[PDB]
Design a protein around this motif. Sequence first.
Motif, PDB file in Angstrom:
ATOM      1  N   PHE A 166       0.816  -1.215   0.000  1.00 28.84           N
ATOM      2  CA  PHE A 166       0.000   0.000   0.000  1.00 28.84           C
ATOM      3  C   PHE A 166       0.848   1.264   0.000  1.00 28.84           C
ATOM      4  N   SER A 167       2.104   1.161   0.420  1.00 24.38           N
ATOM      5  CA  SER A 167       2.988   2.314   0.458  1.00 24.38           C
ATOM      6  C   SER A 167       3.660   2.560  -0.878  1.00 24.38           C
ATOM      7  N   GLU A 168       3.849   1.519  -1.686  1.00 24.80           N
ATOM      8  CA  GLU A 168       4.626   1.687  -2.901  1.00 24.80           C
ATOM      9  C   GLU A 168       4.268   0.646  -3.950  1.00 24.80           C
ATOM     10  N   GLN A 169       4.271   1.090  -5.206  1.00 23.36           N
ATOM     11  CA  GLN A 169       4.353   0.205  -6.360  1.00 23.36           C
ATOM     12  C   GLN A 169       5.801  -0.236  -6.543  1.00 23.36           C
ATOM     13  N   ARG A 170       6.050  -1.543  -6.450  1.00 23.81           N
ATOM     14  CA  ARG A 170       7.409  -2.088  -6.463  1.00 23.81           C
ATOM     15  C   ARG A 170       7.559  -3.284  -7.379  1.00 23.81           C
ATOM     16  N   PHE A 171       8.766  -3.388  -7.918  1.00 24.61           N
ATOM     17  CA  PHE A 171       9.213  -4.516  -8.721  1.00 24.61           C
ATOM     18  C   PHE A 171      10.617  -4.859  -8.245  1.00 24.61           C
ATOM     19  N   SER A 172      10.778  -6.034  -7.662  1.00 24.65           N
ATOM     20  CA  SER A 172      12.056  -6.453  -7.118  1.00 24.65           C
ATOM     21  C   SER A 172      12.736  -7.402  -8.090  1.00 24.65           C
ATOM     22  N   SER A 173      14.061  -7.332  -8.138  1.00 21.34           N
ATOM     23  CA  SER A 173      14.845  -8.165  -9.038  1.00 21.34           C
ATOM     24  C   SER A 173      16.122  -8.561  -8.331  1.00 21.34           C
ATOM     25  N   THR A 174      16.575  -9.775  -8.603  1.00 25.03           N
ATOM     26  CA  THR A 174      17.773 -10.310  -7.983  1.00 25.03           C
ATOM     27  C   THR A 174      18.709 -10.730  -9.100  1.00 25.03           C
ATOM     28  N   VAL A 206      28.453  -6.472  -8.430  1.00 24.17           N
ATOM     29  CA  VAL A 206      28.030  -7.828  -8.089  1.00 24.17           C
ATOM     30  C   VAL A 206      29.283  -8.643  -7.802  1.00 24.17           C
ATOM     31  N   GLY A 207      29.542  -8.905  -6.524  1.00 25.61           N
ATOM     32  CA  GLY A 207      30.720  -9.643  -6.117  1.00 25.61           C
ATOM     33  C   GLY A 207      30.360 -10.911  -5.368  1.00 25.61           C
ATOM     34  N   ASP A 208      30.159 -12.005  -6.110  1.00 22.80           N
ATOM     35  CA  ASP A 208      29.933 -13.351  -5.583  1.00 22.80           C
ATOM     36  C   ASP A 208      28.801 -13.404  -4.560  1.00 22.80           C
ATOM     37  N   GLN A 209      27.973 -12.361  -4.519  1.00 22.13           N
ATOM     38  CA  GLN A 209      26.851 -12.267  -3.590  1.00 22.13           C
ATOM     39  C   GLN A 209      25.634 -11.836  -4.384  1.00 22.13           C
ATOM     40  N   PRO A 210      24.551 -12.612  -4.402  1.00 18.40           N
ATOM     41  CA  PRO A 210      23.328 -12.136  -5.047  1.00 18.40           C
ATOM     42  C   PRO A 210      22.941 -10.766  -4.512  1.00 18.40           C
ATOM     43  N   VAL A 211      22.504  -9.891  -5.413  1.00 21.29           N
ATOM     44  CA  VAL A 211      22.040  -8.557  -5.054  1.00 21.29           C
ATOM     45  C   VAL A 211      20.578  -8.445  -5.451  1.00 21.29           C
ATOM     46  N   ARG A 212      19.769  -7.861  -4.573  1.00 23.33           N
ATOM     47  CA  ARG A 212      18.352  -7.671  -4.834  1.00 23.33           C
ATOM     48  C   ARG A 212      18.105  -6.194  -5.095  1.00 23.33           C
ATOM     49  N   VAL A 213      17.516  -5.883  -6.250  1.00 24.12           N
ATOM     50  CA  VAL A 213      17.312  -4.503  -6.666  1.00 24.12           C
ATOM     51  C   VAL A 213      15.821  -4.238  -6.773  1.00 24.12           C
ATOM     52  N   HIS A 214      15.419  -3.058  -6.311  1.00 24.11           N
ATOM     53  CA  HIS A 214      14.019  -2.689  -6.175  1.00 24.11           C
ATOM     54  C   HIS A 214      13.730  -1.501  -7.076  1.00 24.11           C
ATOM     55  N   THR A 215      12.670  -1.608  -7.868  1.00 24.00           N
ATOM     56  CA  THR A 215      12.260  -0.541  -8.773  1.00 24.00           C
ATOM     57  C   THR A 215      10.933   0.007  -8.253  1.00 24.00           C
ATOM     58  N   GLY A 216      10.951   1.219  -7.764  1.00 23.22           N
ATOM     59  CA  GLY A 216       9.834   1.790  -7.033  1.00 23.22           C
ATOM     60  C   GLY A 216       9.208   2.910  -7.822  1.00 23.22           C
ATOM     61  N   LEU A 217       7.877   2.881  -7.917  1.00 26.95           N
ATOM     62  CA  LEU A 217       7.136   3.803  -8.758  1.00 26.95           C
ATOM     63  C   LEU A 217       6.150   4.618  -7.932  1.00 26.95           C
ATOM     64  N   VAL A 218       5.937   5.852  -8.374  1.00 28.82           N
ATOM     65  CA  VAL A 218       5.052   6.799  -7.712  1.00 28.82           C
ATOM     66  C   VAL A 218       4.310   7.571  -8.791  1.00 28.82           C
TER      67      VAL A 218
END
Lengths: 278, 278
Positions: free
Chosen positions: B12-20, B79-91
């Motif tokens: 309810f606070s944000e439109q989000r799309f997460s990616s790893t 990206v260094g040998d660790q999965p990274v989770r990236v968030h795309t936030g829309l308003v």
Amino acid sequence: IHPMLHQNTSTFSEQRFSSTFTGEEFFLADHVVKGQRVLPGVAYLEMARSAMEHAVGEDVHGNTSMKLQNVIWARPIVVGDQPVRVHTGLVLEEDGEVSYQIYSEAEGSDAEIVVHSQGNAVLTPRSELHMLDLPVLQEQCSEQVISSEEFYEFFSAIQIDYGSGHKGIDKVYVGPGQVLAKLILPLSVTGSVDQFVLHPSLMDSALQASVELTKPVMPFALEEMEIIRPCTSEMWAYVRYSDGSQAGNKVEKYDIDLCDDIGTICVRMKGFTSRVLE
Amino acid sequence: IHPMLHQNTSTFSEQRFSSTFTGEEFFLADHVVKGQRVLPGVAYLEMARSAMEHAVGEDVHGNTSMKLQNVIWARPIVVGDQPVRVHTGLVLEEDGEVSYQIYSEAEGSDAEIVVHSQGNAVLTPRSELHMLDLPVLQEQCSEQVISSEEFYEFFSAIQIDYGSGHKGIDKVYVGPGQVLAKLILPLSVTGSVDQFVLHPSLMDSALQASVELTKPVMPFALEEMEIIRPCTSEMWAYVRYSDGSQAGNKVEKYDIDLCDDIGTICVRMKGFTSRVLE
Ligand SMILES: [Mg+2]
């Protein structure tokens, strides 16, 4: 995401959770109604529940005890050899409440929306952990006793065929305006337990006991539902009349309570109305 | 959902799309920068693009031509040998625009948000399908010519190692204040083409040509981007100065255009600023 809440299909117009039920699911393979393949009224509650939790993000401490108010059921979902996609849509009220709907879109006309269940959801601090008197309850509930088989065989006469997964009822004790029922999760769904918070197998079973007032009875209107602990440990249910004095073969209003081995109330229903299927 | 937009994590606070992004992705295995494993500035645009399309639901007819305005880049994703989770936030703005951000949350402190790219997105009717003069362009762009190998070998001197997937550049024609470049998708990514609308392999290649003004050059600020047709068919790019007269080794502002075999403009950049990596 969740066995009844598959993915998040949210846009700027709506908070949404879409789900597709082929028919392979246990709750959709062990709950036959009028010959047709129907989803149980209780399943609508765990979608509204698991929608809500996910419609709320990272937050610091706070209260978690979700309260589902003024829930209603309009049209059951029938699954006939065609995958059905069901949408759970959420709306946040300025005051703070959240109203919800659980609709679908028909495969013949996609521009049409049909509503299967509505209600409100509000988050609430926990009240006291009410504990029921498990030994005292059987005392008053010693008038009539029904075994699992006889209970389930009684439904098949009404043509409501509960399969392996929905065979959660066990012993059933009757008193005066009192119902008790031991229920256990079925062996088939031994693994699938940690995936749910309001496990359909036990919950629907708890609702099955309410029909023991005595045509297929269908959930109609529940005016309050309170969730505390996950509906997994709990194997005891207890059904009593609500203080409305509104009894009859078409409309009946009860207060059901499910509880742990010990007797810790984990789910608490109030004002639950059941209505006959036409 | 999309090779750079994996799931929808909207509340309810944000439109989000997460990616790893583990690092197995092609755009994250063929675009090495300063030795570290870095995501290309162009990839941020296709997330903002594919976020937007999905942040808009079922709608009757209407305009589709998405225009990304005032895009900026702050901090590359390493990206260094660790999965990274990236968030795309829309308003969604009351006026109708949509502002966006592309952040992440660090694995050491989850209560901290870091912004990698910002901007605005607005939906716009299509203007005329501008067509470039493919034969006339090579005429003026006949002064200097660079081959693929020499082009890519030139970067490796700056330590920007473009692997198989980002080897989309081909022939490069120079004129006076004119750049042209044929580019083709690599064989490695033959299949993966219909998954993208702004295919990184060709787009980044188009951006690679802009550096031919001549330290690792990094996208800094793009003030307009206009998308018409999917960036798949198009194999031609064309870079020219923007009418700002702002040229220099730290800040440069261009107008890039990519176009079909025929020459149908499918993506159109304006005001693209590049800045040196420190
Ligand atoms: Mg919203």
